[PDB]
């Protein structure tokens, strides 16, 4: 089978990563001990894309837990599924990285990295058909931001021809109050432009706006955010984990979503949105699922889709429903909003249907948009960066790790380019 090696690094990285695992582990019927207890053989039929076979009919996540501080390791090991991970697959330091990209990438992350790469080799070396890696991390901190993008550079150098996939959580001052996050984010985006094939942009602005407004969560928590990040992750990976036609491996996805190498930043979207513990009373009708998933209130990146144009788009439907109707409804979308799709990529919307629904939903949809409107997100970060880089403010925290102003100027220029690049393709 085509195997995927999952790496999760830093606080954010390690917590959405654990959540992802417990969600798909349920989906696939694996219990918090690694043993299959489902019905449908559709659960097991592709189980080895994300799990590993051990004697006992036991299934080990092909996951590697990385952090520069022991905190998060111990939390996940003492989480619900804390016990189903290869325990040598926990790589962790002591110092921490103190919300500093330069410490994750350059100084602290250096010591620890080779120990991470050993487990990545040991995992990769026992793959019949490694298709690539998927890393979970945040971009506003120091370990996942700084060490994550270092590992990505080191992984591409040993595996230059396997696919590199990241779920990257973007910082928002609605949820955080560390002043240097715009620095860490720009340094990380600069890396992601050059070294990943597909990046999902989980924006904490969008995650907060959904939770606070839409779901009316008066005092939201990362567990609430991560609830949206959990469902999305399950959504966009359905096509890798069950049998199907479309976007069923990381390469085939990329060839369908990425019309130019740098424009590989994806805008996710889920319907229905749900507060956890939300008693589900009614199913969404297929036209409801369709309308919502394309709606801006439903994106995981705080960008106005009507402010740009869709380059490519993938729609995943789950639960028992009518392909005749999904197909009818997906057509109507493109037909009533046809200017919002570039006319110079014909038929740029591919739609999959999985019969197996997610947990607690009878009906869901997951949207993956490659829209030029995501320039809005990089622009948001870029303006915060500029505001304080133009006065070289807070730069000492970085130059004292051996970084140099020139690097900040580069990362900023590559991102400003990424934005102008997305804009040129908005005009055809």
């Amino acid at each position: 089978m085509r195997e995927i090696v999952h790496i999760q690094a830093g606080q954010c990285g390690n917590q959405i990563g654990a959540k992802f695992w417990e969600v798909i582990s349920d989906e696939h019927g694996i219990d918090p001990t690694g043993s299959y207890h489902g019905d449908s053989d559709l659960q097991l039929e592709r189980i080895n894309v994300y799990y590993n076979e051990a004697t006992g009919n036991k299934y080990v996540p092909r996951a590697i837990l990385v952090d520069l501080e022991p905190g998060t390791m111990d939390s996940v090991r003492s989480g619900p599924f804390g016990q189903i991970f290869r325990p040598d697959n926990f790589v962790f330091g002591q110092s921490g990285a103190g919300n500093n990209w330069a410490k994750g990438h350059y100084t602290e992350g250096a010591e620890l990295v080779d120990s991470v790469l050993d487990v990545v080799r040991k995992e990769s070396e026992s793959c019949d058909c490694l298709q690539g890696f998927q890393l979970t991390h945040s971009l506003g901190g120091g370990t996942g931001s700084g060490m994550g993008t270092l590992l990505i550079s080191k992984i591409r150098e040993e595996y230059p021809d396997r696919i590199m996939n990241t779920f990257s959580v973007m910082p928002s001052p609605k949820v955080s109050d560390t002043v240097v996050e715009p620095y860490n984010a720009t340094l990380s985006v600069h890396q992601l432009v050059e070294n990943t094939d597909e990046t999902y942009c989980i924006d904490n602005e969008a995650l907060y706006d959904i939770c606070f407004r839409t779901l009316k969560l008066t005092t939201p928590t990362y567990g609430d955010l991560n609830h949206l990040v959990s469902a999305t992750m399950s959504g966009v990976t359905t096509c890798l984990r069950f049998p199907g036609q479309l976007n069923a491996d990381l390469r085939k996805l990329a060839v369908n979503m990425v019309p130019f190498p740098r424009l590989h930043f994806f805008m996710p979207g889920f319907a229905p949105l749900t507060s956890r513990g939300s008693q589900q009373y009614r199913a969404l009708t297929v036209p409801e699922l369709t309308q919502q998933m394309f709606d801006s209130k439903n994106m995981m990146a705080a960008c106005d889709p009507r402010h740009g144009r869709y380059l490519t788009v993938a729609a995943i439907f789950r639960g028992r429903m009518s392909m005749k109707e999904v197909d009818e409804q997906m057509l109507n979308v493109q037909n009533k909003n046809s200017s919002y799709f570039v006319e110079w990529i014909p038929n740029n919307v591919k739609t999959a249907v999985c019969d197996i629904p997610p947990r607690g939903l009878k009906m869901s949809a997951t949207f993956i948009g490659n829209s030029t409107a995501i320039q809005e997100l990089f622009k948001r970060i870029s303006e915060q960066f500029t505001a304080m880089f133009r006065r070289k403010a807070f730069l000492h925290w970085y130059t004292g790790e051996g970084m140099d102003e020139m690097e900040f100027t580069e990362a900023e220029s590559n991102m400003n380019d990424l934005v102008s690049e997305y804009q040129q393709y908005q005009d055809a």
Binding site: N256, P261, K324, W344, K350
Partner: protein, 439 residues
């Protein structure tokens, strides 16, 4: 008796393969284990149906075919389904990584890596062949393997078997079932490279099969099974003449003599009827007149296009069931007046007709009802260029922006093979215009 090798390539060709090879088995009365009580030539015989099957001293009849996907998921269903006993492990070739809907990947990267094993595996079949006449190649245009390996294989075949015929059954891309947006890229690329190595191409447009399944068989959202079963009927009409006693279309050279005056215009349009729902409460049987007329309605063709705006260079009527020339000529006579059917001057206005008395065989529990008679027409009309014009337009919209080009280039393909492939297509569309579309 002269054998033909079938080569099924990529997911589409391989799934269409079992669709045919299953039907073939039902028609010749062969069982899922190669047994054919009806053959009394136990271990051989040069009967007409040996062209497609060879015989095993134990009495198994084994298709003269080889399947080959660059990934194992599909062919594994052939080495496990009902007809697993029927094929031979060495004729089901598989690789590990597929071609990610990337022509350049399947032609160059991975292509090279498994061409020789395929060519070898193929020569194996050419040896137990007293007078091999050529090959039928089943593939899709849009996928990685289907487009990029096939064109690779088509060039080794023109090298390894120069005096041999090659026919194509080729699946033209439609978005209602297409799983890639680069499909026009792969289609133009593989058409170009393959154009000089194929003696005759039958393009089934998925869009056409799909509406035929929707309108005529009441099937809400056709699956590949429905599509592939219908394609096996049409394919079986095109090949019936090579496996049954007849005088028309007896060997593959005859196909290009009958359908293909010019070598580049070698894409005959296939049109089939009647297509009825097995579940239809009652159907008043259609007549020779009624089925033959149906052959001029665009809604039965394997390619939606208007042959009234275009000229003909050949026509063949392949009837299966209860037909006699009196009715056939009678019907020709009468549609000749009602319809617009102009041939090109340097060609006679005329029809070649063939009748197999045994009505069409239907897969039990399939979607198609048994019918007392059926016809497949094989017109070569310039009107099929419509399909090239629209595919070439999609190519142009994307290549103007260079969308996706880097995926092919990154595999080694040079940007120019895009423009030289497309420019050849413009030549193709130009010839179709010269020939037809004058008066």
């Amino acid at each position: 008796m002269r054998e033909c090798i079938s080569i099924h390539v990529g997911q589409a060709g391989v799934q269409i393969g079992n669709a045919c090879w299953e039907l073939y088995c039902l028609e010749h009365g062969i069982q899922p284990d190669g047994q054919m009580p009806s053959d009394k030539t136990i271990g051989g015989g040069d009967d007409s149906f040996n062209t497609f099957f060879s015989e095993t001293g134990a009495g198994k009849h084994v298709p003269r075919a080889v399947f080959v996907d660059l990934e194992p998921t599909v062919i594994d269903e052939v080495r496990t389904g009902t007809y697993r006993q029927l094929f031979h492990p060495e004729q089901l070739i598989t690789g590990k990584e597929d071609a990610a809907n990337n022509y350049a990947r399947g032609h160059y990267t991975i292509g090279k890596e498994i061409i020789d094993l395929v060519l070898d595996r193929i020569r194996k079949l050419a040896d137990q062949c007293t007078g091999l006449q050529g090959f039928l190649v089943f593939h899709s245009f849009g996928g990685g393997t289907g487009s990029g390996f096939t064109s690779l294989l088509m060039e080794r075949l023109s090298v390894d078997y120069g005096k041999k015929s090659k026919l194509e059954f080729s699946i033209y891309p439609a978005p209602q079932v297409s799983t890639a947006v680069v499909e026009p890229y792969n289609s133009i690329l593989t058409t170009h490279t393959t154009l000089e190595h194929s003696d005759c191409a039958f393009m089934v447009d998925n869009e056409a099969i799909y509406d035929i399944c929707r309108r005529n068989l009441d099937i809400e959202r056709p699956t590949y099974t429905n599509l592939n079963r219908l394609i096996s009927q049409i394919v079986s009409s095109i090949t019936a003449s090579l496996r049954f006693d007849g005088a028309l279309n007896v060997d593959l050279t005859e196909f290009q003599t009958n359908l293909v005056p010019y070598p580049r215009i070698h894409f005959p349009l296939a049109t089939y009827a009647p297509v009825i729902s097995a579940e239809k409460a009652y159907h008043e049987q259609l007549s020779v007149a009624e089925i033959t007329n149906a052959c001029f309605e665009p809604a039965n063709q394997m390619v939606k296009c208007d042959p009234r705006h275009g000229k003909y260079m050949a026509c063949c009527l392949l009837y299966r069931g209860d037909v006699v020339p009196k009715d056939v000529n009678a019907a020709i006579a009468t549609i000749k007046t009602k319809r617009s059917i102009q041939f090109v001057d340097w060609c006679p206005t005329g029809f070649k007709v063939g009748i197999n008395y045994q009505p069409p065989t239907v897969v039990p529990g399939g979607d198609l009802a048994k019918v007392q008679r059926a016809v497949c027409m094989l017109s070569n009309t310039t009107a099929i260029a419509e399909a090239w014009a629209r595919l070439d337009h999609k190519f142009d919209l994307m290549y103007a922006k260079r969308a996706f080009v880097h995926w092919y280039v990154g595999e080694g393909m040079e940007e120019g093979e895009f423009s030289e492939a497309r420019e050849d297509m413009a030549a193709l569309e130009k010839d179709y215009e010269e020939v037809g579309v004058d008066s």
